[PDB]
Write a protein that binds this ligand. Sequence first.
Ligand SMILES: C=CC(C)(C)OC[C@H]1O[C@H](O[C@@H]2C3=C([C@H](C)COC(C)=O)C[C@H](O)[C@]3(C)/C=C3/[C@@H](COC)CC[C@H]3[C@@H](C)[C@H]2O)[C@H](O)[C@@H](OC(C)=O)[C@@H]1O
Ligand SMILES: C=CC(C)(C)OC[C@H]1O[C@H](O[C@@H]2C3=C([C@H](C)COC(C)=O)C[C@H](O)[C@]3(C)/C=C3/[C@@H](COC)CC[C@H]3[C@@H](C)[C@H]2O)[C@H](O)[C@@H](OC(C)=O)[C@@H]1O
Ligand SMILES: [Cl-]
Ligand SMILES: [Cl-]
Ligand SMILES: [Mg+2]
Ligand SMILES: [Mg+2]
Ligand SMILES: [Mg+2]
Ligand SMILES: [Mg+2]
Lengths: 236, 236, 6, 6
Amino acid sequence: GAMGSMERASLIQKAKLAEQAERYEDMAAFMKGAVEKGEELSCEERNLLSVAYKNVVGGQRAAWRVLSSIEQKSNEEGSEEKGPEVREYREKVETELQGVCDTVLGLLDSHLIKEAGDAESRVFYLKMKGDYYRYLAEVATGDDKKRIIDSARSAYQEAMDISKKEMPPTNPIRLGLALNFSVFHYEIANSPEEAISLAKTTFDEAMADLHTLSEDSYKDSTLIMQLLRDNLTLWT
Amino acid sequence: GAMGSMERASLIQKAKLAEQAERYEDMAAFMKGAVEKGEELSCEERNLLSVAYKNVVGGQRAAWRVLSSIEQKSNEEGSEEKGPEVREYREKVETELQGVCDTVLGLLDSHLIKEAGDAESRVFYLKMKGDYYRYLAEVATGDDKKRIIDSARSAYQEAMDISKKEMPPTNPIRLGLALNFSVFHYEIANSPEEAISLAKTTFDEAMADLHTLSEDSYKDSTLIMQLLRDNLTLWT
Amino acid sequence: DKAKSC
Amino acid sequence: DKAKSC
Ligand SMILES: C=CC(C)(C)OC[C@H]1O[C@H](O[C@@H]2C3=C([C@H](C)COC(C)=O)C[C@H](O)[C@]3(C)/C=C3/[C@@H](COC)CC[C@H]3[C@@H](C)[C@H]2O)[C@H](O)[C@@H](OC(C)=O)[C@@H]1O
Ligand SMILES: C=CC(C)(C)OC[C@H]1O[C@H](O[C@@H]2C3=C([C@H](C)COC(C)=O)C[C@H](O)[C@]3(C)/C=C3/[C@@H](COC)CC[C@H]3[C@@H](C)[C@H]2O)[C@H](O)[C@@H](OC(C)=O)[C@@H]1O
Ligand SMILES: [Cl-]
Ligand SMILES: [Cl-]
Ligand SMILES: [Mg+2]
Ligand SMILES: [Mg+2]
Ligand SMILES: [Mg+2]
Ligand SMILES: [Mg+2]
């Protein structure tokens, strides 16, 4: 690892500098090096890891969708043959996106998940596992697509079971997990009714638990609750 | 070159796809490969080259300024010693930024400038040369800073001389060149009066030539003229 | 349209 | 403040 010679604390420090500089590739490389030191991650350090790769893969996904749309138009009735370049470049971006997903999943499997005992950490990592199998699913088209989808579902489901038993309905990780599992149902698993039912139930149960929270915790939950409301308005 | 096996036309095609996808590192790599085919660039191909590296170096410059500001605060009176990490990461970004500038300058020197005979191409490339020496100057602090500044000035000046003799005052390349040379005077050469005089004279002479233009050319010039006006308002 | 996630 | 360029 190119980060093997840098102190763990220095990697965390530089990941925070990279975030301030919006250098998310650097941020992700620093946090990969931090994870590979072998120590568990703190709550703040987990957020740095997820934000870094979320932004990296986020830009790859947006570019993939631009290219895939161009590719789909090029294969319509009446479109002039432009050669293999559009497919080639879409495959280039797709392959880089899959490498990032494989890298995150490798970190979760070696060895973040197995050493995660507290609900907040274990649910967090299992959500990540579901997220990055979902991103693999968004671009999957071959003989392993169904197993990729089920790997996302399986990771999300174990996270859901833990979060419902160990976390209050307003916990931001529990809310973000449910939001994304609902998106998985709608966009990946062809289960729009399940996606809608999950978003409603999640929102309503969090609504009924807000009275227990301080002003700061109240603000934290409602931000993600609004995303649940946004998707319901989009979907209904 | 990793692009040595791809057709020139395919590199141009993919640079345009990368632009649509906002993948400017890819865009720049494709256009570097295109240049290295050894053929001169068309007007449209020159714009692809400049847009690609402008965006790449633009993001590096913005990150460098974030980090340099943090570094400067850390060296103020009353700041706690945080170790070498801030300087280290600023130097990392700075070194990557300098490598991109060196790469562009190498392309201009091998061999875009020497084969550029038409004013539109020669002024375009000489402007680029001045721009990327200016970006080197923004981060220069050592024994070669004065020569880096003079290399930017020398490139800008030769471009200015050609553009004034061969191009109308409203030509967008001539306008962008003058805008940037004025910025060079203000931000690099500690010559704010020269920067202001150049921006005014450029704006006024273009104003007096708009009557010769079609509606489309009229729109093209005024966009950059407004940037000259913006800087004058900022500077006065 | 793409749904919101986090 | 940073001036505009092109
Ligand atoms: C890591 C970067 C920084 C900016 C330092 O922190 C990111 C953020 O980290 C925390 O927020 C988390 C968090 C997000 C919050 C909803 C953002 O709140 C804001 C901006 O007001 C978005 C981030 O991506 C992050 C880290 C992601 C997770 C997500 C992870 O799945 C594996 C599940 C839900 C969400 C949880 C973990 C949030 O608690 C904090 O509660 C946020 O502080 C505030 C004011 O809310 C902080 O902005
Ligand atoms: C390469 C990308 C695409 C988007 C295909 O074209 C970039 C642009 O390329 C041309 O515009 C150039 C150009 C710019 C125009 C001012 C943008 O006009 C718009 C958006 O309305 C900005 C670009 O960076 C570019 C290529 C840069 C140069 C600059 C190069 O210095 C070495 C000098 C001034 C400016 C000149 C070359 C402009 O003519 C065209 O005139 C623009 O078309 C329109 C509607 O104005 C097009 O947007
Ligand atoms: Cl490609
Ligand atoms: Cl570093
Ligand atoms: Mg150590
Ligand atoms: Mg443990
Ligand atoms: Mg050929
Ligand atoms: Mg020639």
